[PDB]
Design a protein around this ligand. Structure first.
Ligand SMILES: Nc1ncnc2c1ncn2[C@@H]1O[C@H](COP(=O)(O)OP(=O)(O)O)[C@@H](O)[C@H]1O
Ligand SMILES: [Mg+2]
Lengths: 97, 337, 289
């Protein structure tokens, strides 16, 4: 609930993120659930291989920021390509009519 | 003109639908992949697959987050050319090392390398050859005047220093650099280190090489810096050796694909010019579409270029099945080796 | 306890729970001390008689009027509220030390077992209301009486120890206090989100800063919200924050001056002062001495 509650606040700050409002609430839970599953694998990874990997709340803040930056760059590239394709399609449709 | 316009319109509509689907897939893919970048680094090859392909992919499908079903990480995050570049640098061809590479470029936090044998170091040395200098850029954690000789000079200049023999425990004076907390006056970005402010350029990079097989890092340390397991593993070497056997044996087949794929990537770009050229020129032309011969020509020309591309992409997909059958047959050599 | 809460002011049922408090905490203490043993890890676990002192310190800070007002403000009998207070205060001394979530759940049992057997008269009404999952927390700052129009023009909020029923009602108050802190300290911005556990921690820290002659030791892996919540608690508390400035020139002599300015603020003039220390601020082990 802590990780999910942090993920909520980060999604609302994320203005450029365009999706369904239903989807965002699934993503929120996913973001948090991710950080638990890593902590469950860390403990398994200590028993199975005797290697200690430390994940902290600070790491959860950093992962979210990295994800947001990557998503923004990918979204900007996709949006410019989509806008060019849409303009071309509209011109082609007008020409065909 | 009707036939050409109908074909062009169908292709454009398919592309727009594909782009919307791709954007939803990209949000899901970024969620699956960014998770990989931030967390999966310190784990071995087996556990990265377990932590991403078995845990996160399962989580996604249940939640109903829109994600591409295959989502090959290597393909999505980085171009196939830049992988080709890292091989020339010295980054091995095996799957783990590629990801290790990807994490270094895409991480906001300063990377840390676990490698007992400097394979990850010898890659970061061959890359960034312009920004790296041989003398007074590489130091050990412990030096008489580590701070004022190396660190201070490298921040001021913006040259990529590489910390050597980190040996598990990191010095607390370095903490503020790893944090990236900056007191900004203008554009200088002065960073305090043990009380003393130091001019940090944006181009400065830090790399920290552990030379121990199993280092025990503190949570504060593991949070401050992204930890990358660069260790050579039997399952890792196998995939390098398999790479080297395929380059030697059935060379002619593998080469023809590498030629075809390079010529296909060209023909995608080539087609992108002609359909662009039409869009630019079909607005500029305006009236009397039926007597506009210079435009009409490229509309028929685009379709031949599109048909050509479509035929190669089918043949490309066939050759990737061919080479993968040979990848299975020559597996026993590599694994033995 | 008999001097601080008198027979006259309280109802006949309420004062039967007051007499029971003193007998109760000891029954709980013995069960807790016999099950949670000191080891190389979890070394602090060991329970002293300071931990019995501190439990009560919590109960006696919660005023007579607030326990008699419980039927109006908390919409529960006064006798019930009082056990609610006890449960919280026992928890804040015994449960807060415990390092993992499993060892907390065991102790929450021993608080519930005891409560039911010590307060037999209101057992059936205790059992249904009080669980480890449900939240009946206490703070001093609950009251929204600080309006903060052009500073604190409308007196101040009487810093009284009250109960809050829901975390959601609490979140609105605490969110307003955070947003206000950022307004008052504009140089050092504190962007923070108050989730269910973070709110609990803020009350826990604001309790320790409030009680007379009590220092707090916050143990977390790092970036766990320790520092941020401390500066908020201090700000809500209306007490001055002092933080050691670490420079190479600064040494054991300068610390002594920085502590001296603390006593100069605290002992002299009569200002509530919270001295803040982290791993970072301890340059050498002599400072910590
Ligand atoms: N409850 C929280 N809400 C928002 N941010 C938090 C929270 N807990 C930790 N953080 C973030 O993690 C970092 C940890 O620092 P802080 O909690 O102030 O002290 P410490 O580093 O000792 O935990 C902070 O910079 C803060 O932004
Ligand atoms: Mg912190």
């Amino acid at each position: 609930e802590a990780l999910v509650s942090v993920a909520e606040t980060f999604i609302k700050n994320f203005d450029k993120l365009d999706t369904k409002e239903e989807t965002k609430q699934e993503l929120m839970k996913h973001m948090g659930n991710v950080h638990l599953m890593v902590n469950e694998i860390c403990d398994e990874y200590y028993q199975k291989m005797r290697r200690q990997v430390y994940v902290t709340p600070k790491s959860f803040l950093s992962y979210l920021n990295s994800y947001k930056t990557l998503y923004i760059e990918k979204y900007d590239e996709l949006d410019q390509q989509e806008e060019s394709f849409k303009i071309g399609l509209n011109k082609i449709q007008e020409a065909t009519i | 003109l009707i036939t050409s316009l109908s074909g062009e319109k169908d292709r454009w509509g398919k592309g727009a639908q594909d782009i919307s689907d791709q954007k939803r897939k990209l949000v899901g893919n970024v969620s699956l992949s960014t998770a990989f970048i931030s967390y999966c680094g310190p784990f071995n090859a087996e556990y990265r697959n377990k932590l991403a392909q078995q845990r996160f992919v399962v989580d996604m499908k249940k939640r109903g987050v829109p994600v591409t079903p295959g989502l090959e990480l290597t393909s999505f995050l980085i171009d196939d050319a830049t992988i080709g570049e890292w091989n020339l640098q010295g980054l091995p061809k095996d799957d783990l090392s590629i990801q290790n590479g990807i994490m270094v470029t895409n991480s906001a936090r300063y990377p840390l390398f676990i490698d007992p044998q400097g394979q990850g170091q010898n890659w970061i040395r061959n890359k960034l050859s312009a920004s790296i200098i041989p003398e007074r850029c590489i130091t050990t954690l412990s030096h008489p005047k580590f701070k004022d000789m190396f660190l201070k000079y490298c921040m001021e200049s913006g040259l990529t220093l590489i910390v050597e023999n980190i040996e598990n425990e990191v010095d607390p004076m370095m903490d503020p650099v790893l944090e990236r907390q900056i007191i900004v006056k203008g554009k200088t970005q002065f960073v305090n280190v043990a009380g003393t402010e130091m001019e940090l350029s944006k181009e400065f990079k830090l790399f920290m090489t552990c030379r121990l097989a199993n280092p025990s890092f503190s949570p504060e340390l593991s949070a401050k810096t992204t930890i990358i397991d660069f260790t050579v593993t039997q399952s890792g070497l196998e995939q390098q050796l398999l790479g080297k056997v395929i380059s030697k044996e059935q060379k002619a087949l593998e080469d023809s694909l590498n030629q075809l794929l390079a010529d296909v990537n060209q023909n995608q770009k080539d087609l992108q010019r002609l359909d662009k050229n039409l869009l630019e020129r079909l607005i500029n032309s305006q009236g009397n579409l039926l007597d506009d011969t210079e435009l009409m020509d490229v509309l028929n020309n685009t379709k031949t270029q599109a048909k050509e591309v479509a035929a190669k992409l089918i043949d490309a997909e066939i050759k990737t099945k061919e080479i993968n059958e040979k990848r299975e047959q020559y597996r026993p050599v590599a694994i033995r080796g | 306890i008999k001097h601080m809460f008198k027979q006259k002011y309280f109802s006949d049922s309420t004062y039967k729970v007051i007499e029971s408090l003193t007998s109760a905490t000891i029954a709980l203490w013995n069960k807790v001390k016999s099950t949670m043993l000191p080891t190389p890890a979890k070394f602090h676990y060991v329970f002293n008689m300071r931990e019995l002192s501190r439990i009560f310190k919590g109960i006696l800070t919660c005023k007579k009027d607030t326990i008699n007002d419980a039927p109006k403000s908390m919409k529960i009998k006064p006798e019930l509220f009082l056990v609610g207070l006890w449960r919280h205060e026992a928890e804040r001394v015994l449960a807060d030390k415990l390092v993992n979530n499993k060892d907390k759940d065991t102790v929450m049992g021993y608080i519930q077992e005891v409560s039911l057997e010590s307060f037999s008269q209101i057992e059936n009404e205790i059992l249904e209301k009080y669980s480890s999952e449900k939240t009946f927390l206490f703070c001093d700052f609950l009251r929204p009486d600080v309006i903060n129009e052009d500073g604190i023009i409308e007196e101040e909020a009487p810093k009284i120890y009250e109960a809050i029923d829901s975390l959601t009602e609490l979140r609105k108050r605490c969110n307003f206090l955070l947003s206000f802190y950022n307004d008052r300290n504009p140089s050092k911005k504190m962007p923070l989100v108050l989730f269910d556990d973070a709110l609990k921690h803020l009350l826990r820290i604001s309790r320790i800063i409030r009680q007379p002659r009590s220092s707090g030791l916050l143990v977390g892996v790092g970036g766990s919200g320790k520092q941020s919540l401390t500066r908020l608690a201090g700000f809500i508390g209306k007490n001055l924050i002092q933080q050691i400035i670490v420079t190479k020139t600064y040494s054991d002599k300068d610390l002594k001056e920085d502590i001296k300015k603390g006593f100069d603020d605290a002992g002299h003039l009569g200002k509530q002062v919270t001295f803040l220390m982290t791993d970072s601020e301890v340059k050498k082990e002599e400072f910590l001495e």
